[PDB]
Amino acid sequence: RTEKIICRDVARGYENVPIPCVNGVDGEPCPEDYKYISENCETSTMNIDRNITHLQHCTCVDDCSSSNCLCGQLSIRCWYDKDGRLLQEFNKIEPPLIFECNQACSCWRNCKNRVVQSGIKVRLQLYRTAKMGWGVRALQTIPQGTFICEYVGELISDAEADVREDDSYLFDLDNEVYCIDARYYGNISRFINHLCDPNIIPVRVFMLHQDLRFPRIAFFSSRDIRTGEELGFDYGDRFWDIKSKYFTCQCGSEKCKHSAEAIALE
Amino acid sequence: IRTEKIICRDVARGYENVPIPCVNGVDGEPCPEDYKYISENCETSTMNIDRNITHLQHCTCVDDCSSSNCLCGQLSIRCWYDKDGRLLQEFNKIEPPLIFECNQACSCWRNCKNRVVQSGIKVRLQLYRTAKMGWGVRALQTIPQGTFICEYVGELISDAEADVREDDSYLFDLDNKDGEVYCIDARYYGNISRFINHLCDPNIIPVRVFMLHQDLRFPRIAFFSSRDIRTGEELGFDYGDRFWDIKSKYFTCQCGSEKCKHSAEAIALE
Ligand SMILES: CCCC[C@H](NC(=O)c1[nH]c2c(c1C)C(=O)CC(C)(C)C2)c1nc2ccccc2[nH]1
Ligand SMILES: CCCC[C@H](NC(=O)c1[nH]c2c(c1C)C(=O)CC(C)(C)C2)c1nc2ccccc2[nH]1
Ligand SMILES: Nc1ncnc2c1ncn2[C@@H]1O[C@H](C[C@@H](N)CC[C@H](N)C(=O)O)[C@@H](O)[C@H]1O
Ligand SMILES: Nc1ncnc2c1ncn2[C@@H]1O[C@H](C[C@@H](N)CC[C@H](N)C(=O)O)[C@@H](O)[C@H]1O
Ligand SMILES: [Zn+2]
Ligand SMILES: [Zn+2]
Ligand SMILES: [Zn+2]
Ligand SMILES: [Zn+2]
Ligand SMILES: [Zn+2]
Ligand SMILES: [Zn+2]
Ligand SMILES: [Zn+2]
Ligand SMILES: [Zn+2]
Numbered sequence A: 001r002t003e004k005i006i007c008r009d010v011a012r013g014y015e016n017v018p019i020p021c022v023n024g025v026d027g028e029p030c031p032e033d034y035k036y037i038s039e040n041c042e043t044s045t046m047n048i049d050r051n052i053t054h055l056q057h058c059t060c061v062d063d064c065s066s067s068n069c070l071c072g073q074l075s076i077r078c079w080y081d082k083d084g085r086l087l088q089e090f091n092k093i094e095p096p097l098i099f100e101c102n103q104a105c106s107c108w109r110n111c112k113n114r115v116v117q118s119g120i121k122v123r124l125q126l127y128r129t130a131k132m133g134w135g136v137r138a139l140q141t142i143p144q145g146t147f148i149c150e151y152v153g154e155l156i157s158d159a160e161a162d163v164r165e166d167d168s169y170l171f172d173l174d175n176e177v178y179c180i181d182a183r184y185y186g187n188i189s190r191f192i193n194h195l196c197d198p199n200i201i202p203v204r205v206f207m208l209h210q211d212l213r214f215p216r217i218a219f220f221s222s223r224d225i226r227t228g229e230e231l232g233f234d235y236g237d238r239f240w241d242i243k244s245k246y247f248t249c250q251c252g253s254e255k256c257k258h259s260a261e262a263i264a265l266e
Numbered sequence B: 001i002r003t004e005k006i007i008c009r010d011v012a013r014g015y016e017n018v019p020i021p022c023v024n025g026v027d028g029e030p031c032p033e034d035y036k037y038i039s040e041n042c043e044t045s046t047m048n049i050d051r052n053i054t055h056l057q058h059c060t061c062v063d064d065c066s067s068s069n070c071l072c073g074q075l076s077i078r079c080w081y082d083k084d085g086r087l088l089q090e091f092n093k094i095e096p097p098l099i100f101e102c103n104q105a106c107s108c109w110r111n112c113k114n115r116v117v118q119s120g121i122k123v124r125l126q127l128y129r130t131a132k133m134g135w136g137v138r139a140l141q142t143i144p145q146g147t148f149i150c151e152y153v154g155e156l157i158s159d160a161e162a163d164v165r166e167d168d169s170y171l172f173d174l175d176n177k178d179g180e181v182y183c184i185d186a187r188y189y190g191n192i193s194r195f196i197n198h199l200c201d202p203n204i205i206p207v208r209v210f211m212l213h214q215d216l217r218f219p220r221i222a223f224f225s226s227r228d229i230r231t232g233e234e235l236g237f238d239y240g241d242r243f244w245d246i247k248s249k250y251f252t253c254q255c256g257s258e259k260c261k262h263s264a265e266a267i268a269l270e
Helices: A070-074 A158-163 A237-243 A260-265 B071-075 B159-165 B241-247
Strands: A004-007 A021-023 A124-128 A134-138 A147-151 A153-157 A170-172 A178-186 A200-206 A216-221 B005-008 B022-024 B125-129 B135-139 B148-152 B154-158 B171-173 B182-190 B204-210 B220-225
Touching (some): A153 A158, B154 B159, B159 B182
Parallel strands (some): A021 A124, B022 B125
Antiparallel strands (some): A124 A134, A147 A216, A153 A178, A170 A178, A200 A216, B125 B135, B148 B220, B171 B182, B204 B220
């Protein structure tokens, strides 16, 4: 069975690079039961605080590579090396909040503290997996620490999330608590699966606003990733505690945490 | 015999598609820094802009949105951009129509033909010291008629706020004929447009445009060339008789055109 290219770019040109879709596994057509968006949307009054005088910002006259950058200090330090990658000493288990530079900073748009706001740079592909439906994999080697993509979707309150009947695309910001629901509106990140041996991590980031209701979710590689490797992050125990009553994990890792065999041993 | 100095390689600090340098060959005035350059409109208090994605009108096109089926074109009466991204010749240059560009709710691609203003500055511009009008903006290249130049960017404020500030040197009135009145004030936060002088023989026109939202209270202001512009020519638009009927009480127009309407030479004729 050939691996049919079925969409040249599921992002319709909204990302820096195309995201093709292929399926060499079954007959499932290119997913179209959602609206691809590259940035978060709202479907009720959120009124994100965008008051430019409310932004904390830096006064740097360099490239914001020094430890005196206020934006870096709000992040404990700027965690981006010279190439835009997270430092090796970055805490991949309890990631800090990242405050990037913004439109109030005196620095230039290309300073060292602007990785997530500059968008996707790696070649990704939406593909049909063997056991998990659609997935996302790398079309290039990706060094550890590289920004992959943002979890983009519909901004909704925790109360609205509690009413909705499909939480398969719901990312809880864990702040009043708000969520990103990618069920109806989403980007490439809604197709990234759970892996008990993840290779990307979510990190909360502020960029062009600092409304603490709405951190933005940035995925970075937690290790070097080989070409063709599926991308995945740890959906978390709360997800699998709820979803256990319906299905079990198919990641096939020797340290799988939620497989039938694994849960049966409990 | 003063030589021209380059005093900033990009007043936009890299926020635009292209750098916008500033030069002075006229006096000792340094690069203006009494404002904050921003590439997009800002808020200093809650405007409650309607950004509900389900309120967007959008098209269902699969092509490059060049057909008459495109709803976004229809909302503008038609799509007024030609294949090159220029406003059509028959486009009304007096009371122009609202332009509704395609948006994130449309099914078309980000590169369709109805996305000129949201794609940003493409022509090469220069901030320079004029002889009689302070700073101005001039073209570094030929600019054919109909080309998008830049957006009037600044701080969104209410009518009542504008009336408190009593300073319209950098104030653009959106002139919403229906309901709530808002202004763009580029005094404190602005982009290259704040530096565009008034000309009695103008070569650009402002056009109200909607892009990522369709809150009719907050059209965005897009400047397009109203004629072919030659390299070196200062850009300017007609500030409007209302501006001068207020300001001529204080100073006269220095555009120096034979068709000047606000000169001292012409102020004694009527
Ligand atoms: C589909 C999306 C992946 C599953 C999704 N993850 C998250 O919400 C989530 N929030 C957070 C993290 C993570 C994985 C972190 O790592 C840290 C944090 C960003 C601070 C907060 C999820 N978990 C759920 C639990 C119950 C009901 C629905 C659920 N959806
Ligand atoms: C300094 C900024 C350029 C002067 C500025 N122009 C405008 O507001 C303005 N609005 C409009 C157009 C124009 C020039 C149009 O061509 C048509 C339109 C876009 C529908 C509405 C101005 N004029 C004023 C008159 C009185 C008090 C303050 C003022 N500010
Ligand atoms: N490790 C996993 N084991 C089994 N199913 C998974 C796993 N990870 C993701 N899934 C499936 O994918 C859903 C989560 C989605 N966000 C991921 C995209 C999904 N695979 C799709 O094709 O749309 C889950 O509700 C599961 O149906
Ligand atoms: N036609 C004109 N004649 C004389 N002064 C003008 C003319 N057009 C603009 N100006 C001056 O520039 C102001 C408008 C500004 N938005 C333009 C930039 C301004 N020249 C500056 O140097 O900052 C006016 O209040 C005047 O001070
Ligand atoms: Zn800095
Ligand atoms: Zn900063
Ligand atoms: Zn910076
Ligand atoms: Zn597993
Ligand atoms: Zn269309
Ligand atoms: Zn459209
Ligand atoms: Zn379109
Ligand atoms: Zn004049």
